[PDB]
Write a protein that holds these residues in place. Structure first.
Motif, PDB file in Angstrom:
ATOM      1  N   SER A  77      31.800  18.679  -9.429  1.00  7.53           N
ATOM      2  CA  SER A  77      32.358  18.605 -10.778  1.00  7.53           C
ATOM      3  C   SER A  77      32.861  17.186 -11.007  1.00  7.53           C
ATOM      4  O   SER A  77      33.940  16.821 -10.508  1.00  7.53           O
ATOM      5  N   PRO A  78      32.124  16.356 -11.748  1.00  4.94           N
ATOM      6  CA  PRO A  78      32.535  14.950 -11.898  1.00  4.94           C
ATOM      7  C   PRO A  78      33.726  14.749 -12.819  1.00  4.94           C
ATOM      8  O   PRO A  78      34.406  13.722 -12.705  1.00  4.94           O
ATOM      9  N   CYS A  79      33.995  15.683 -13.726  1.00  2.00           N
ATOM     10  CA  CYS A  79      34.938  15.485 -14.820  1.00  2.00           C
ATOM     11  C   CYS A  79      36.041  16.530 -14.764  1.00  2.00           C
ATOM     12  O   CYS A  79      35.764  17.733 -14.773  1.00  2.00           O
ATOM     13  N   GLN A  80      37.288  16.069 -14.704  1.00  4.06           N
ATOM     14  CA  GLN A  80      38.432  16.965 -14.810  1.00  4.06           C
ATOM     15  C   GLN A  80      38.872  17.167 -16.256  1.00  4.06           C
ATOM     16  O   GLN A  80      39.226  18.285 -16.647  1.00  4.06           O
ATOM     17  N   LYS A  90      24.686  10.483 -12.565  1.00  7.21           N
ATOM     18  CA  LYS A  90      25.409   9.430 -13.255  1.00  7.21           C
ATOM     19  C   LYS A  90      25.604   9.832 -14.708  1.00  7.21           C
ATOM     20  O   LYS A  90      24.693  10.372 -15.338  1.00  7.21           O
ATOM     21  N   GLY A  91      26.794   9.561 -15.226  1.00  4.97           N
ATOM     22  CA  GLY A  91      27.088   9.807 -16.624  1.00  4.97           C
ATOM     23  C   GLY A  91      27.992   8.721 -17.165  1.00  4.97           C
ATOM     24  O   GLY A  91      28.827   8.163 -16.450  1.00  4.97           O
ATOM     25  N   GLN A  92      27.807   8.418 -18.449  1.00  4.25           N
ATOM     26  CA  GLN A  92      28.575   7.372 -19.122  1.00  4.25           C
ATOM     27  C   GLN A  92      29.792   7.969 -19.832  1.00  4.25           C
ATOM     28  O   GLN A  92      29.965   7.855 -21.042  1.00  4.25           O
ATOM     29  N   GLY A  93      30.629   8.634 -19.053  1.00  2.00           N
ATOM     30  CA  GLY A  93      31.833   9.250 -19.561  1.00  2.00           C
ATOM     31  C   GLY A  93      31.836  10.744 -19.310  1.00  2.00           C
ATOM     32  O   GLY A  93      30.911  11.311 -18.730  1.00  2.00           O
ATOM     33  N   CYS A  94      32.902  11.382 -19.780  1.00  3.88           N
ATOM     34  CA  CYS A  94      33.100  12.803 -19.553  1.00  3.88           C
ATOM     35  C   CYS A  94      33.032  13.571 -20.862  1.00  3.88           C
ATOM     36  O   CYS A  94      33.768  13.235 -21.800  1.00  3.88           O
ATOM     37  N   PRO A  95      32.182  14.588 -20.978  1.00  4.10           N
ATOM     38  CA  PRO A  95      32.048  15.301 -22.251  1.00  4.10           C
ATOM     39  C   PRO A  95      33.116  16.376 -22.415  1.00  4.10           C
ATOM     40  O   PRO A  95      33.879  16.688 -21.501  1.00  4.10           O
ATOM     41  N   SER A  96      33.135  16.960 -23.615  1.00  7.53           N
ATOM     42  CA  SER A  96      34.122  17.988 -23.928  1.00  7.53           C
ATOM     43  C   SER A  96      33.970  19.198 -23.017  1.00  7.53           C
ATOM     44  O   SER A  96      34.966  19.782 -22.576  1.00  7.53           O
ATOM     45  N   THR A  97      32.736  19.578 -22.711  1.00  6.09           N
ATOM     46  CA  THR A  97      32.511  20.729 -21.857  1.00  6.09           C
ATOM     47  C   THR A  97      32.628  20.327 -20.394  1.00  6.09           C
ATOM     48  O   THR A  97      32.521  19.153 -20.029  1.00  6.09           O
ATOM     49  N   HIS A  98      32.846  21.327 -19.550  1.00  3.28           N
ATOM     50  CA  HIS A  98      32.997  21.089 -18.126  1.00  3.28           C
ATOM     51  C   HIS A  98      31.613  21.021 -17.497  1.00  3.28           C
ATOM     52  O   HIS A  98      30.773  21.896 -17.730  1.00  3.28           O
ATOM     53  N   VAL A  99      31.369  19.973 -16.717  1.00  2.00           N
ATOM     54  CA  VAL A  99      30.053  19.711 -16.148  1.00  2.00           C
ATOM     55  C   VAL A  99      30.030  20.206 -14.712  1.00  2.00           C
ATOM     56  O   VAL A  99      30.906  19.859 -13.910  1.00  2.00           O
ATOM     57  N   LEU A 100      29.021  21.009 -14.388  1.00  3.70           N
ATOM     58  CA  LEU A 100      28.772  21.464 -13.029  1.00  3.70           C
ATOM     59  C   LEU A 100      27.438  20.884 -12.598  1.00  3.70           C
ATOM     60  O   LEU A 100      26.422  21.093 -13.266  1.00  3.70           O
ATOM     61  N   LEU A 101      27.448  20.140 -11.501  1.00  4.25           N
ATOM     62  CA  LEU A 101      26.243  19.558 -10.936  1.00  4.25           C
ATOM     63  C   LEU A 101      25.848  20.342  -9.698  1.00  4.25           C
ATOM     64  O   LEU A 101      26.679  20.567  -8.810  1.00  4.25           O
ATOM     65  N   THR A 102      24.587  20.764  -9.652  1.00  8.70           N
ATOM     66  CA  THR A 102      24.057  21.515  -8.527  1.00  8.70           C
ATOM     67  C   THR A 102      22.811  20.826  -7.993  1.00  8.70           C
ATOM     68  O   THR A 102      22.062  20.188  -8.737  1.00  8.70           O
ATOM     69  N   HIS A 103      22.629  20.931  -6.682  1.00 12.84           N
ATOM     70  CA  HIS A 103      21.415  20.496  -6.009  1.00 12.84           C
ATOM     71  C   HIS A 103      21.046  21.603  -5.037  1.00 12.84           C
ATOM     72  O   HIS A 103      21.916  22.099  -4.315  1.00 12.84           O
ATOM     73  N   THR A 104      19.777  22.007  -5.029  1.00  6.56           N
ATOM     74  CA  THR A 104      19.374  23.194  -4.285  1.00  6.56           C
ATOM     75  C   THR A 104      18.003  22.999  -3.657  1.00  6.56           C
ATOM     76  O   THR A 104      17.059  22.578  -4.331  1.00  6.56           O
ATOM     77  N   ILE A 105      17.903  23.311  -2.366  1.00 10.43           N
ATOM     78  CA  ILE A 105      16.626  23.388  -1.665  1.00 10.43           C
ATOM     79  C   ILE A 105      16.281  24.859  -1.476  1.00 10.43           C
ATOM     80  O   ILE A 105      17.053  25.612  -0.872  1.00 10.43           O
ATOM     81  N   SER A 106      15.131  25.277  -1.995  1.00 14.38           N
ATOM     82  CA  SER A 106      14.689  26.662  -1.898  1.00 14.38           C
ATOM     83  C   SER A 106      13.413  26.762  -1.071  1.00 14.38           C
ATOM     84  O   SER A 106      12.674  25.790  -0.902  1.00 14.38           O
TER      85      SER A 106
END
Lengths: 149, 140, 147
Positions: C91-94, C57-73
């Protein structure tokens, strides 16, 4: 065969509501599991894999902000109250579609799945907040199932 | 072991198609014509995941679909078991976008049934994360 | 009830980190499965159903491009090496929201069947703990069960 199991699908003919059917091809409801009041009933205690998927669809983005939620709850006999087991939230719209620009469709699936200790007589529900955005066009997009392992 | 099981992964070297490699695949399950064959009747957990990736958003609207189908011996025709749709681009732009799809459910399968897991846009497949585009079953 | 099983949920009181708890409410950790160093320990070899979900969850989109990862190792005992089992990217933000920021939600669910060995340790990790959402239990979870 043998193990309690269920895999029910949404009624495609019920507009704007999530109604689970069992009497369809590639759908299961046997070995004690019942479908009563739109809820799966557990016939015996044990470890159960619970899972559900819903698919949302909307034409364009409206002025208001849309939050799509999908939730699997448990109604225990001991409590007779709804308790959330698995839930997720999605937001398809960052901006309302510009006035004059064509409305483009959006799709948002939500999948839920986990293993839980259930008691005999527990009732399981899989619910959404925006049934008006539900998509039934293709079979296999809205389903709800459990199985004792 | 004992019960039929399979876990196959996408061929990263196969251009413009979702081609499953023949690397889990034991206890009767076979992979022929890009489809899993059920060796014996029973309850099966079927699951699959695909990863889509694109370097930007085009003027037109892109629809990504992932579908697990069943070709039953009794009812020989392609039937949807699990399916999902995603739309990566709401507005036209270049920044990359990522879209995963996971499917999973329990089904009664018969001996000789054929299972397929297919997509519509293989050109948007993501192989950066090897082993993440896969298709598997296991008798419960 | 016989089978090794675990279903742990994220600690809502841990800010900026993904810490798995073994709770009293619908959370499982029985029949040999252990939770050590924020990691699930496999008590016996076999095929395991592995799954996890996180909610960003984020309260808006920042200047940089956000990459969200989830990983099971997986961390094997003999090798002690990290092997990636399940991962996903979102990627939540275009574009960065130009200055009325609206909240966004992006869940990631992972699931698969894997052959695990006795003593293997499983980890469920994210890259952006600052975007994690803990409001409602049952939105961040991690579980296994021997099939």
């Amino acid at each position: 065969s043998d193990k309690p199991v269920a895999h029910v699908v949404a009624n495609p003919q019920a507009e704007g509501q999530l109604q689970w059917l069992n009497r369809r091809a590639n759908a299961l409801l046997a070995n004690g599991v019942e479908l009563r009041d739109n809820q799966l009933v557990v016939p015996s205690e044990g470890l159960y894999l619970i899972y559900s998927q819903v698919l949302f669809k909307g034409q364009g983005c409206p002025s208001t902000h849309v939050l799509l939620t999908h939730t699997i709850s448990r109604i225990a006999v001991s409590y007779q109250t709804k308790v959330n087991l698995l839930s997720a939230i999605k937001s398809p719209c960052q901006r309302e579609t510009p006035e004059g620009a064509e409305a483009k469709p959006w799709y948002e699936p939500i999948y839920l799945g986990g293993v839980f200790q259930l008691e005999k007589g527990d009732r399981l529900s899989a619910e959404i907040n925006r049934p008006d955005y539900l998509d039934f066009a293709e079979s296999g997009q809205v389903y709800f199932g459990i199985i004792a392992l």
